[PDB]
Amino acid sequence: SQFIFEDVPTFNPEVGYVAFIGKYGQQLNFGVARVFFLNQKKAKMVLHKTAQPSVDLTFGGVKFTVVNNHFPQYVSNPVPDNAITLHRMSGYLARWIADTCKASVLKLAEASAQIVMPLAEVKGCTWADGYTMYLGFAPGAEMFLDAFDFYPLVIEMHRVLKDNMDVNFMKKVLRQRYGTMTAEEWMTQKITEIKAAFNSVGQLAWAKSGFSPAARTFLQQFGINI
Amino acid sequence: SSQFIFEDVTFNPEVGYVAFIGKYGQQLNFGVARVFFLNQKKAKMVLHKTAQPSVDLTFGGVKFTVVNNHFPQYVSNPVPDNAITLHRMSGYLARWIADTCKASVLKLAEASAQIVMPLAEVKGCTWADGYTMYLGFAPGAEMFLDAFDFYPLVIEMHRVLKDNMDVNFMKKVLRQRYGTMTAEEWMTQKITEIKAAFNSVGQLAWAKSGFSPAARTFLQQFGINI
Amino acid sequence: SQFIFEDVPATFNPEVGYVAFIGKYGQQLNFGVARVFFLNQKKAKMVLHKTAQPSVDLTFGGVKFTVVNNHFPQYVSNPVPDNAITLHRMSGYLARWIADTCKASVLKLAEASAQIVMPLAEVKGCTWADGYTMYLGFAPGAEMFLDAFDFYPLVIEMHRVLKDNMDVNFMKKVLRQRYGTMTAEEWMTQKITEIKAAFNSVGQLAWAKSGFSPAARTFLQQFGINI
Amino acid sequence: SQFIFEDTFNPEVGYVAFIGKYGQQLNFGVARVFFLNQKKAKMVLHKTAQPSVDLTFGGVKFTVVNNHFPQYVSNPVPDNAITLHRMSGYLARWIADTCKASVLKLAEASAQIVMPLAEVKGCTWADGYTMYLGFAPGAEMFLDAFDFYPLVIEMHRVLKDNMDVNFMKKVLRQRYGTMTAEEWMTQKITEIKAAFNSVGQLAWAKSGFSPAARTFLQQFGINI
């Protein structure tokens, strides 16, 4: 039925992260994250197909209670600020690796071996380019522009420029804080380091995914550009 | 063998409004309209799915007999001049709020609090821009170009220009009267006030709705324009 | 009988087809019949599309025609006999019939003027005042008889590609037609003078953008909207 | 299992499989019906909610994987299966191989088989079997057998017909016998430009208009 309609009458990522670590922190290792970031795309699909508002997903051998944000019906439902979606959980895992890494070269080599960000590899970015950039490709990492030196922001700037991503997907990022500053503040006081990060990712073999360089050169000869 | 055989065989919005008010007027309040305009898009979808030429829809707690104009089969069927489609009813509700408002600041504040026009908010238009423009975004408000100072007309001119709306959806509007004048008349005698209204809505953060001014300046520096 | 595909097994002279048409239905015709046909042709095409029967009996005015169902999805590609009538052919024949019936009497021309309406002509602001060959020339099928309609069917279609941006491939057929005794390869040369004349004549019709008055199209231009 | 996460196609083998299974039942009448109804069959597949379906062309029943129903597009296809696309390619290859070796056989094909996609662009058996059959969907799998025609034909659709360029991603990954795409893009540009130039002579948008008709229309400012 419902030929009847009636009236429809906050989130701090830094606290959400501390909550996340509080609950799952002891059980984490790079094997877990490796599996998460290789299967994040897959997990989003099963969430889409599954009619259950919260579900228990297991990556590596660690079970996470995740809010189903993706099943058609639930997209518009409010999410609690101490919950995790795949997006948040992606951001938190990325932050966790970032924090774990910086403080040891032994730890950085371990991550380099285990962890893969498809979204980074597609654009020809690797650990050699540095953890903040490489991990910056992870969904959710825009919550922590501090920790990833603005890479998440500039990476999304390039997708609209080069890959013709819809501009509206940047609305969110441009509301984020940089540690203690407002977006309305760091857009001003941080353009120097932002243009630097922008220029740095701008050096990555970014590609029209699915045409090799040799294929582009080939087509040019018959007057076809991409 | 009844249709393998062929042989031989004007709506006034101002009277329709009076009819509408005549029937449903006593039961209206801004809460009803609020629910209507928040769920109009939804109601159009259920009408599309529902195989029943007239249906009883209830907004707030008020039941309206509405002609199903949207189910694939019924689009081309003639509609009586004392009936209401979602479109008409949207127009009448908008007109009712416009008339109710103009005459009192107390009444205008009440509407400002209760009523939301998604189509206005998407393009960054609000009550602050004035009731004629804001309410002008409501479907059906083109019936009353008088009452909404041509806004409904120019708004649709911008959608074809900026949003690449199909031009054929303007056929109807360009047949409307402006109080006592024919479309063939106001297209001439009213281009000055029309270009003014056109220019006014042309100032609304159309694609820029949801990007602060500081965010737009920021993106410009990396050659991204909104 | 839907996961199964099978049977698939170019002469046609419109002037003989017309004689056949008249031979069979001629005695029963009058302008009332045609009036109903041309007002309902579009409707009849839709019911043919919905109806699963390879030939059907359609009745316009009070006259029953055996018409080959060319339009039902399944039948589009099957061959049509040269002594059969589709809605297209029948439209052409009816138009020819009215043209022939008219020319020979002013009394008869007035009768047609009162009865018969060509939607496709009225949309572009053409009327009987402009002359029967032009007005009737708008009828589908009339390109079969470029002789009888002084090339109007051909030039009318030239304008739809120019002004209305019609697909050019719908002209393939017309450019293969004969002008009485001449080949297309011949009248494209020997008849350009009268063709440019006909072209120019229809080019004077208020070729209105369908659904938008001329004043509406001028208006929108001022805000940089073109149709 | 679905909530738990822990840690190839060779057209030449597919063809051999295809022939292995359906080869004895084939004839030009079957292909004729397939290629005239391929567009039709794609539509019914789209409407039909059944991941594999039995389609019959001429009087031969083929088990075909439904690649087209909205839900199934993204599902992996086995390497020994046939989609309409593959099956189109294999049939085209089969006719190509069958023809080359006999003039009697070529005349039989000429009479029976029609490639709509070729006829639309004014290409016929007179232009040669490689080019004509090259128009068949799936024939890009065998750029060897059809002398690069499938590839250049698709280059023209993006140039002349404004086809979306992304539909060329696949073709540009194909092998030319023993070479990689990364190889023949270099070593074969001479023969590729030749094939490109050859199809570039076909009455592309002019199919169905005599020369005299084109000259005529020019006079009223209509160009083909």
UniProtKB/Swiss-Prot annotation, chain C:
Keyword RNA-binding part of the UniProt annotation: yes
Keywords noted in UniProt: Ribonucleoprotein, RNA-binding, Viral nucleoprotein, Virion
Name of this chain's protein: Nucleoprotein
Gene Ontology molecular function: any one: RNA binding
Record keyword Phosphoprotein present: no
Main location: virion
Domain commentary: The N-terminus and C-terminus are involved in homooligomerization and play an essential role in viral RNA synthesis.
S-S bonds: none
Protein species of origin: Bovine Schmallenberg virus (isolate Bovine/BH80/Germany/2011) (SBV)
Coiled coil: none
Record note on quaternary structure: Homotetramer. Binds the viral genomic RNA.
Gene3D superfamilies the UniProt entry points to: 1.20.142.20, Bunyavirus nucleocapsid (N) protein, C-terminal domain
Residues that hold RNA according to the record: 10, 42, 45, 71, 89, 160, 172-173, 176, 178
Subcellular location per the Swiss-Prot or TrEMBL entry: Virion
Function in brief: Encapsidates the genome, protecting it from nucleases. The encapsidated genomic RNA is termed the nucleocapsid (NC) and serves as template for transcription and replication. The NC have a helical organization.
Family: Belongs to the orthobunyavirus nucleocapsid protein family.
Gene Ontology CC entries for this record: ribonucleoprotein complex; viral nucleocapsid
Superkingdom of origin: Viruses
Database matches in InterPro entries: Bunya_nucleocap, Bunya_nucleocap_C, Bunya_nucleocap_N
Pfam families xref list: Bunya_nucleocap
